[PDB]
């Protein structure tokens, strides 16, 4: 008399959690992009577990916390990660920048770095940031064509189609 578990075939869990980061460092994001997917449910002996899921990340500059504790972006910019030595956790920040070419000489701005306090995290974000909103900067090869089309129309649009006309970019500074 073996008790077959409810999650045996064919009634297993179809969809897995997929908890963790959903954008890597230096990636460009805009408000609403989910930087990290997380859940509220917590294991009953967490301090003894070892899988990387159980240990959540922390919001930082220009990042919000969702209802299920997802970390989502709040400004147009590029992702950066930081390590908090005091709390021994990872912190997700977004450095605000307008869309432009990501150069090799600028990649150091998105290195993962060690900090002791969130004040120092903000200081480091300011120091690595490219420019401020009130002064702006000279954009190096900024995009000029309209954005990719909605997903429900086409999933595989082309980025910066030369056949399309130039349209003003007036949303990536917000």
């Amino acid at each position: 008399s073996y008790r077959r578990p409810s999650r045996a075939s064919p009634t297993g869990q179809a969809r897995k959690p997929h908890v963790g980061v959903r954008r890597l460092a230096a990636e460009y994001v805009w408000p609403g992009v989910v930087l990290v997917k997380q859940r509220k449910v917590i294991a009953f002996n967490v301090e003894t577990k070892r899988r990387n899921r159980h240990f959540k990340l922390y919001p930082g500059e220009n990042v919000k916390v969702s209802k299920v504790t997802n970390l989502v972006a709040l400004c147009h910019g590029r992702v950066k990660f930081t390590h908090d030595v005091s709390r021994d956790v990872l912190v997700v920040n977004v450095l605000p920048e307008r869309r432009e070419e990501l150069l090799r000489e600028d990649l150091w701005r998105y290195r993962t770095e060690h900090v002791r306090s969130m004040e120092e995290n903000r200081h480091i974000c300011f120091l690595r940031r490219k420019a401020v909103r009130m002064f702006g900067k000279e954009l190096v090869n900024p995009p000029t064509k309209p954005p990719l089309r909605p997903f429900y129309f086409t999933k595989y649009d082309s980025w910066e189609n030369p056949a399309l006309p130039d349209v003003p970019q007036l949303d990536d500074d917000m």
Partner: peptide
Amino acid sequence: RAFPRGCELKDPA
């Protein structure tokens, strides 16, 4: 030099 515009200059006045 030119300067980027503020939030006020972007409302539909």
